[PDB]
Design a protein around this ligand. Structure first.
Ligand SMILES: Nc1nc2c(CCc3ccccc3)c3nc[nH]c3cc2c(=O)[nH]1
Ligand SMILES: Nc1nc2c(CCc3ccccc3)c3nc[nH]c3cc2c(=O)[nH]1
Ligand SMILES: [Zn+2]
Ligand SMILES: [Zn+2]
Lengths: 352, 352
């Protein structure tokens, strides 16, 4: 049987790495993109915030857990819920115990993720608002580090979870190198199975994010996976892999798919635009996905313009397939020692 | 090679028949349900009214026709467009030449369907409003019969269409037996490849529709397929097959699928209802579709309640699959001489 958690690096190029995470439910090839399970990927995302509200974490456990519920027997990552409460909820009330909204604490977060049955459990953190002064960023980071220890203990107190899932710590510190170093030191001292770079993809722009990644990723344990949360556009991913990131999630493939935007090797396109009404080429000339095997930009443009659900499904299937082809190309080129050439070739074509 | 059009009846029970329509692009097993191609079926529907407006019939021909456009190389039926103009358009203006809206004529209808490339072409008729007085129903029917002859001639003037497609005449006459007889006589004298019962599914209720079918279907040529337009609910189809109908279309599978209603052997259910929030059974216990193979009512209820497009796609896939399983069961039981028992068993379970 596979171990509970084992990360091995098969090849490197500069700061980039490619390898595998072994877990009881399957293997995850890295760098990995992790799509929302609500729709090939090796791991999908559960929506902790939505699930604790409908139908509730207890109801999901009663239904047999998220794997059974969603019909997905491979690994599932779940976020810890505070980021989502802090962005999509009202009348939020924060304190050292946790957050109240209309009480999510480290312990409750971990228990919710346990009842959901997810394989990769995120520590309960505070995604510090951007921008932030040094003092507020430090205060926030210090509380997240106390909350990280409380998450560690809650996770270790549940035998089924401690023996079958994995726990990731989330680095905070806003854009400040010394706070990122302190956060990294505190996490490493607690000890986690993986480490996420939190508090980015919060409006900072790609230049600032890349700058923060430049000094932040090397503070994490090299021998454990690095998860950049909430990122990102295809060029964000390529640049973040260049900076040592192993795992990604982003709202873009599914949000774009529902709003008429398709990702291609030549950049994104809005398929609703009239220039596609008679374009017989598939969404992308090279894409191996099923949509691109059967249908033209013209027919997908027509479905979406007509309001047919089929169109949004075909766009979403293509976008998710495109992201996985991107990750496959990143892994192959790292493994073959030509990732640097690939990144240059990707950006020249993607931005042309 | 298959012929342009050949209908053969393999077995009968009472007025019910089962058999096949051979056409150059494929075989159609009857009784047949014909789903909207905009999403196994043997024939799909093109939306003449929408397509003549976006992107236009000429643009579809420029793109290679509807088979190429939709990625579907099997038969396609198209309606003649007037029913749709008369129900979904504004500022309609009618005359002996045709209908003007914001000029669809028999000749233009046929040419539009030719440019679309459909395999089964509907005569350009007037679906008489319901209810209607004898005099208005007769006037309307008499114009549709003149229009049927004009459709015949337009169809025969286009060599590629006359040699590769099929043309159906549409009986009108509202609920009046003598007008239905006159309409049937006029169509048979013109001569068509199949005959549709038009002017039903316009609000009359199942009792009245079945009454009209009782005397109307036997006026049509027995040796040609009978197409009841716009029908219907599963119990409508079963009863119409009992009355000699061979072909059906209906908005229900796709409209229901987008609004939370799933058809089952035990009747329809609204999956959004709270009673399904913890129901681990598939949408239907017997259904062989992929959705019912993998997912519970509970998870589909959750997707739809959450607004996820995945849910509406899974409901639609199930509903269309259910209709085709219904038709398969009708064909098998007719062919095995137990359709009467089947209809009784279907209604007892469906309405229980
Ligand atoms: N816990 C946490 N989540 C973040 C997310 C959501 C990632 C997520 C993972 C899995 C499911 C849903 C959401 C961010 N999205 C954009 N920027 C983000 C920052 C953070 C962060 O600092 N902490
Ligand atoms: N031409 C025509 N169409 C009808 C339709 C649409 C069937 C159709 C077929 C293929 C595609 C779209 C629509 C009806 N729908 C409900 N009742 C109906 C009656 C008629 C009718 O009398 N004539
Ligand atoms: Zn594709
Ligand atoms: Zn089903």
């Amino acid at each position: 049987d596979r171990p509970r958690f084992s990360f091995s690096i098969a090849a490197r190029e500069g700061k980039a790495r490619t390898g595998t995470i072994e877990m009881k439910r399957g293997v995850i090839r890295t760098p990995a993109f992790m799509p929302v399970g609500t729709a090939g990927a090796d791991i999908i995302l559960g929506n902790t915030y939505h699930l604790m509200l409908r139908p509730g974490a207890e109801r999901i456990a009663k239904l047999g857990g998220l794997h059974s519920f969603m019909g997905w027997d491979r690994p599932i990552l779940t976020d810890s819920g505070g980021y989502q409460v802090m962005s999509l909820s009202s009348l939020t009330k924060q304190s050292e115990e946790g957050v109240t909204f209309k009480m999510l604490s480290p312990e409750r977060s971990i228990e919710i993720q346990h009842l959901l049955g997810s394989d990769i459990v995120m520590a309960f953190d505070e995604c510090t608002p951007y921008p932030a002064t040094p003092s507020r960023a430090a205060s926030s980071m210090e509380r997240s580090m106390r909350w990280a220890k409380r998450s560690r203990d809650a996770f270790d107190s549940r035998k089924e979870q401690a023996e079958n899932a994995a726990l990731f710590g989330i680095q905070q510190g806003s854009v400040f190198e010394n706070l990122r170093q302190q956060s990294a030191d505190a996490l490493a001292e607690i000890g986690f199975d993986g480490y996420a770079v939190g508090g980015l993809a919060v409006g900072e722009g790609q230049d600032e994010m890349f700058r923060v990644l430049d000094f932040s990723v090397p503070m994490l344990p090299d021998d454990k996976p690095h998860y950049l949360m909430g990122v990102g556009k295809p060029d964000d991913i390529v640049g973040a892999v260049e900076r040592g990131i192993d795992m990604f999630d982003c709202v873009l493939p599914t949000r774009s798919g529902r709003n008429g935007q398709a990702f291609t090797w030549d950049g994104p396109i809005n398929i609703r635009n009239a220039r596609f009404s008679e374009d017989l080429k598939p969404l992308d000339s090279e894409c191996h996905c099923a949509v691109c095997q059967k249908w033209s930009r013209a027919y997908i443009h027509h479905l979406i313009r007509a309001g047919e659900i089929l169109g949004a499904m075909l766009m979403t299937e293509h976008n998710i397939a495109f992201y996985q082809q991107l990750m496959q190309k990143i892994r192959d080129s790292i493994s073959e020692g030509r990732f640097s050439q690939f990144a240059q070739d990707f950006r020249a074509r993607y931005f042309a």
